[PDB]
Amino acid sequence: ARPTLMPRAQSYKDLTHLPAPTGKIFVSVYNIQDETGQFKPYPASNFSTAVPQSATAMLVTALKDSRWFIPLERQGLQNLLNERKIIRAAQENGIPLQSLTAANIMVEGSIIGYESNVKSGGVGARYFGIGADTQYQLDQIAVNLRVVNVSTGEILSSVNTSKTILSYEVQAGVFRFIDYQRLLEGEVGYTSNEPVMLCLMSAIETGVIFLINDGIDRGLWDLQNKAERQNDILVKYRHMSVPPES
Amino acid sequence: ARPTLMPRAQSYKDLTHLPAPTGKIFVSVYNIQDETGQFKPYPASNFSTAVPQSATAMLVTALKDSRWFIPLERQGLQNLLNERKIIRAAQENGIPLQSLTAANIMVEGSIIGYESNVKSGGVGARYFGIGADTQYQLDQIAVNLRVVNVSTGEILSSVNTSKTILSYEVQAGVFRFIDYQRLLEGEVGYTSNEPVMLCLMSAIETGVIFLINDGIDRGLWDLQNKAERQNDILVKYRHMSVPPES
Amino acid sequence: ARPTLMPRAQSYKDLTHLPAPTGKIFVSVYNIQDETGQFKPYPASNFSTAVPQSATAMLVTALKDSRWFIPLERQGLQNLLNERKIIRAAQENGIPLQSLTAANIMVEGSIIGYESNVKSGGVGARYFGIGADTQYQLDQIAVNLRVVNVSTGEILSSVNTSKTILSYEVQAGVFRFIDYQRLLEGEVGYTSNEPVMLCLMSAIETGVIFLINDGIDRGLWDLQNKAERQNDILVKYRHMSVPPES
Amino acid sequence: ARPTLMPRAQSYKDLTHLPAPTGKIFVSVYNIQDETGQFKPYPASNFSTAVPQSATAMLVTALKDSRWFIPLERQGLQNLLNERKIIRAAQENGIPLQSLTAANIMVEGSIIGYESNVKSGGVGARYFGIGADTQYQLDQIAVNLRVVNVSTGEILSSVNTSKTILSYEVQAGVFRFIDYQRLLEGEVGYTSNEPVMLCLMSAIETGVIFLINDGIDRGLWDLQNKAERQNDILVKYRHMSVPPES
Amino acid sequence: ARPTLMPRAQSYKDLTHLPAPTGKIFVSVYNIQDETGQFKPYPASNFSTAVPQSATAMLVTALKDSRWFIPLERQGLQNLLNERKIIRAAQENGIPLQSLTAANIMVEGSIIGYESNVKSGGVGARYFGIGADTQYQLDQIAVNLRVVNVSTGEILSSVNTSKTILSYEVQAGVFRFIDYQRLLEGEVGYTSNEPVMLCLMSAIETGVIFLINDGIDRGLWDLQNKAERQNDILVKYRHMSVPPES
Amino acid sequence: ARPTLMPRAQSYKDLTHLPAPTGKIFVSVYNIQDETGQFKPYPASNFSTAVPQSATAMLVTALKDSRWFIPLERQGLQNLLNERKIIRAAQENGIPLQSLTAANIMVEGSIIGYESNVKSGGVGARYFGIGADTQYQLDQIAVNLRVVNVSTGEILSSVNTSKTILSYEVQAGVFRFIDYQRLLEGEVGYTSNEPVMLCLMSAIETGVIFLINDGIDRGLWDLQNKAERQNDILVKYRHMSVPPES
Amino acid sequence: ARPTLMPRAQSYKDLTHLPAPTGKIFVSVYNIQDETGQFKPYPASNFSTAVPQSATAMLVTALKDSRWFIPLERQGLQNLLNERKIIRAAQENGIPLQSLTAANIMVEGSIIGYESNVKSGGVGARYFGIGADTQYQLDQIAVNLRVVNVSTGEILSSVNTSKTILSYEVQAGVFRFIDYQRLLEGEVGYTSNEPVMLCLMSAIETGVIFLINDGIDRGLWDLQNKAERQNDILVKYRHMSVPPES
Amino acid sequence: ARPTLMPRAQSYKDLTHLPAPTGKIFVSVYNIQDETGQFKPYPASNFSTAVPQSATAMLVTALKDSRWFIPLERQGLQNLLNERKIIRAAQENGIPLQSLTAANIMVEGSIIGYESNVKSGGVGARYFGIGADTQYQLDQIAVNLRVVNVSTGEILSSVNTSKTILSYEVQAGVFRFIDYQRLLEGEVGYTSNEPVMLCLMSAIETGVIFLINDGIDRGLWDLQNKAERQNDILVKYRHMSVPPES
Amino acid sequence: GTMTFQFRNPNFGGNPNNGAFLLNSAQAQNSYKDPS
Amino acid sequence: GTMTFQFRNPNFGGNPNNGAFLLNSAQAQNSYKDPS
């Protein structure tokens, strides 16, 4: 096909239309570790991880496009410090650069577990020759995000989100004897694996709005206008603040 | 589906409605090690661990939402100390930050073993063509949590909790000869693996309430009101203080 | 089901009702190494250990609930020393902490071997269509515990305990021809693996009482009252002081 | 066949005809990490990565041929610094070289996940002997690119792109009995795997134009002529600035 | 069943009733290395060692219960020295401990080889339907122990012991046709693997008595009474002092 | 069975009855490396070595019981030096030990190769139902030992020995039809693998006598009496001084 | 059987009867590396090397028994230097040793490749029931040896030798029907793998005589008598000085 | 068979009869790396390299026997420098050695790739019972050698050579029914793998003559007599100086 | 452990080795004769 | 997990072990006699 932007869920359109704050908040995003410890089963490789190791690149895109935070490069800090030695070596030899911008808070977190085959199922039916069947699985991924006050070392707010990755498959088939000593045959199949790459981005973009909403109730950072406290987006994520039961 | 919060058991609603203490207690949560040493069997990978390595991110969410403890960032301490060098380098060049908040106690612990296939079973039945069957397994996970007084190095209280992870499967089936030289066929199946990701969170959130309850009987920390000593939650976890037999 | 405490054998109720000593004895529990060197066979993973690596977390729970010892944090000593640097850095900047409590003895030990399939067996029987069978295995685990006088470096007492882990399986079955050209079928099965997680805790909790009993006969530490020397618990573990034969 | 240049998509002809800026912008491209963590399944090797590790060599070719950036060697910096020790050793012994050119911005990024078998399918049909079938899979790759201001450490713009890698297969076949006791047979097959090597280059060359376009709207760097703001290329990538839905 | 002491062979009752010496001899037991280099075959894991790595914990129990030696902690010396830094840090801040007790001799050694399937065998018999069979294997383990004079570095005495680990299996079976068109079936089986964990302890406890007996003939250490030189135990291990032939 | 000494070949009785020298010769035995590089084939583990790694513990037993050499602890020298720091620390605090005894020569060597299946064979025979067969293999192990003068660094004498490890198997069998519609069946089998653990000890104990005999002809060390030069043992190993042909 | 010396080829009897030189030449033999890089195929282990790693112990035996060279311990030099620290520590405390003997030349080399299945073959024949067959393989090993003048660093002489390792197998068999409804059966087999352990020793012992012969023609070292230049051994290895063709 | 020299191709007889130069040229041969990265397929081991790692020992034999170069020991330089410390330690204690000879040029290079199964093929034919077949493969190996001027660091000449390794197999067979109810059978087979050990030596010995010939045309080193410029050997390698086409 | 769903029928996605058992256990139980 | 599409027919790309079941379950259901 053609290259385009990464496709986005309802939460990304729900994230962009957030109310604006008074001033933007700097944030250091160091590392979101893949602490699932779960690899892909057969017939994949023994080494391929179930969740991609790039959750820290997805969170920076969530914070930057939210129009609330100004993210700072702390992932490739060792490459950024090696670049600022090269500018400083050319300064003394034939504008002076200022120091690095430092953040008030640092958002860090994990990917707390990935369970595959939480539920399964399947229907099938064959009359005389003609058949059809269905299958589905759904895996569950969970993301932990917490805001750390870097001044004192405390933890301000911590939320857990979740997402269900549905992977179904529909297949038909015909194996009959049409009129004597002739044999008909046909198959039509279709599968659809939802990518865990794209369901991780929709669970992180939702967990950001639970951090921004929890900052307003706890008085951490205030909105630009108090009349926009009753926005339809923030009243939608306040009903989801209680978790589902089990 | 849609992203939401991580689903919570009865213990989380049992944890939030705890009585309030006099003052909040700081706590350092360094590392909860996966000391099970148990990996997933075939047909999963040889490398995938049976229990996720993110138990330390689950305990901080249990302590923070309990409204008793103020957790402190000690997991990513090496990233937090590297951030406070960048602020301090911009302080001398063109508000002074205070030191890190230190804790009175430090909650640490482990995951003491994970045994798979503790019990099993299964029924089956086939009359003329029509069939049905059932299966179930249940695994057992155990969590150790202990409170360490960091002033003297003693151990104040230590509790062990447990949880049973049921994983059943129901399947039907029909393979008959309906009226001469025609063949009917149908299958309906359904499995349900309970996630070990979610049963680890319910065993940790229960083991926190056995630490808070054991602090009140031993005089470690006292409640805000002594009339709330007879709460229905704390009288429920005092009956469970004796272990089951074997 | 519901989360609860870890289920306990007869030895835990036998451990709690011990007589009280004159004063509690501090103890350092550094590391109990899994020196079995035995991994799980097929169809488990090649990497999963047969005995969990968390025996040092189980012994601290045995010593703490015995109401004789005050255990000290020496497992996570490197995390406890890093915490006391953070308090000491905030002391000089804008109560002085005392030093770590040190122990008189240090209980250390191992897990001396785990042999699987020590005994086996099985019965089976089929008459006309109807059948039944049984199987059982029993594995053997052994725990070494020894008390080290830390003043001189000697070894005061050393005991070995053992436990047999029974794992049976009962299965029925019917494959008959009921009245002409109909076919009956039924299966009922049930297995029960005793967890090695829970049989390790019952062998450690028994080996503690053989250390406390051996301290009284050797004059290491004395009871609070000499009339309680003739307790029914201590007279029960004196008959078991001679080992079984082979 | 014959060696030639690497074949290029529509985006490369779309990249070369961009409007010219006022002055060229230096850029350091250190490392684009393969953070997919996904390896190739059977019957390939267990060790072969799904995405090539050479994305940092592809981005430099995209920046250099865009006629906007002057890329700088920062990948083999340790080899370039060892060369400048050899020139400097021959300078003191029997033109003095200037220092390294340093960049204003540094483009860095990742490959955020690679999901294989996102969709599948297949048709088949056999009448009397003569048959035909079809298959197709399509994998999805995603590339993260972000521009880091190296003076302050902020992140200026960050975009995500995506690409679908179609891999189909068409096969015919005949197995008949032509006139008595003779047997005809024929097969014709054809597959076509689109290379992930070449679809990674088309997703990076598209993500560069989303960085150049986002610089003009945010006032980072301005065009040479404001009448060329309404170019047909830049108005084409402004309609694609909103992502697809899911 | 119930936890108990580790079951002991004839040699342990033969070890406890040894004559008493003049004074007890200190001994350092550093490490008994598993130098077999033999792992368990299929269907066990590739990684599980044939002999447990805990022979050094078994020898200390043999020396301590022999009522001749006072063993010293030299295995966990790095943990014992870290404990004595904590006492010494609390000494200068608000009884002085003496130095470590040092030994006259140090008993060290190895496990010299483990050969599996030294001998095998098996009988079988089936008449009309009714059957029975038998199998047996026997493995051979060997233990080296030597006493090192730590003053001069010489080797005082060195002995090799051996043990045969029998593992048999008995199985019956019936597959007949009882009265027309009925089918009887029955199986009864029983195996018994002798543990290599327990046969290593009986080869070490025997090799200790060959060290104590060889000390009396060489004048290394003398008995408390010379009339007890003619004990029935020491005259039993003097007849076994010559090895079997091959 | 019962524990006993390791069974010994003809060479051990041939080694003990050697003539006595003038004075005993000290010897350092550092390490005999398993330089075979040969592991065990299927169905054993991939990791289990064919020859045990404990040849250095077998040579010390050969030198000590030969009544010619006084061996010195140089294998666990790092443990012996750590013990003599503990005595020396208790000397200055509230008999002075002499230095380590040093050797005139140092016996070192290797295990030069282990070839499996050098020869094989097998007979079989079946008449009407009744059968019998035989198999045998023989492996070959070789041991290098050389005496190094530690004063100058020269090599005084070097010998190579060899041993053949026979492993046979005898099996019978009956599968007949005794009187009409009855079926007899019987099997009797027996294998015998000679241990490579025990054939390594008999090749080392022989290679010691070729070192002691070569010392007398070269004038390295002389006998106590020259009339015992014509002993029946030393005249037996002088005929074997020429190697077999090939 | 019985232990004996390692069996020797024609070259060893050809090596011992060499003419005597004027004076013996010291030689350092550091390491002969197994640079084949070839491991054993199935059904052996994946890790077992095709050629043993002990070629450096075989060359020292070739040089020592040649009555021309005096070899020096340079393999275990780190053990020999640790021994001479122990003598020197006892010298200053309550004969002074001279320095190590150093060599004029140092013989070093490699094992240049090992190719398995260079040639193969096999005959078979079956008439009515009675059969017979034959197989053979032959592998090829090559040894490089070169003499290095240690004074200047030059290479004096370098030779390559080779050897063919034949491994045959002969098997018979009978499967007939002797007189009606009786069945005869018999098999007789025999294999013989020549050891690569023993063919490496015969290729090294031959390559030594090509070094000694090349020293006399180049004037490196001269014989004791010039009349012995025309020996039958040295005139035999001068005809083999030209290589075979290919 | 019997040990002999390594068999040599036409190029070795073509190398020895080269014209003589004015003076011999010293050369350092450090390391020829196996940069093929190709291992042997099934049924060999996974670890065995396709090309031996001893190409640096083969090149020194090519340079030494060419009667043009004097090679220097630079492979085992760390062993040669450790030997010259031992001579120098005996010099000061109770002829002074000169420094190492250093080279004008240093020949280094690689093994640029090894492709297996470049071509294949096979014929077969069976009439009534009697059959025959043939197979062949041919692999391709390539060697890079380049002369480095060590004074300035330039590269003087660089050549690539190649060789084709043919491996064929011929097999016959008979499976007939000779006169009624008798069965004849016979097989005759023969394979021949050309060793890659020996084809690497013939590609290196050819690549040396392309270096010596390229030195004379470029004026690097001149012949002893200009009348020998027109030798039949050097005019033969000048026609091969142009490569084959593809 | 994990309970993964699989069809027991080789017509759908399932193991093909119990195809010969599924058909032989169906023709051993049918009682429909040929109508004519 | 991942749902990979595979044909259930050995004529197309599929497992060959259910070929003998696919044909035996088709000839046990056909009702077409020989026309003549």
Residue numbers in the entry:
A (entry chain H), B (entry chain I), C (entry chain A), D (entry chain G), E (entry chain B), F (entry chain C), ...: 10 to 103, 111 to 262
I (entry chain R), J (entry chain Q): 1 to 36
Give excerpts from the publication.
The curli biogenesis system in Enterobacteriaceae such as Salmonella species and Escherichia coli (E.coli), also known as the nucleation-precipitation or type VIII secretion system, is responsible for secreting curli subunits into the extracellular milieu to form cell associated nonbranching and highly aggregative amyloid fibrils. Lipoprotein CsgG forms a nonameric secretion channel in the outer membrane and transports CsgA and CsgB from periplasm into extracellular environment. Two soluble accessory factors, CsgE and CsgF, have been thought to bind to CsgG and play a crucial role in substrate (CsgA and CsgB) secretion and curli amyloid fiber formation. To address these questions, we determined the structures of complexes in curli biogenesis system by electron cryo-microscopy (cryoEM), including CsgF and CsgG (CsgFG) complexes both in the free for and bound to the N terminus (residues 1–22) of CsgA (CsgAN22).
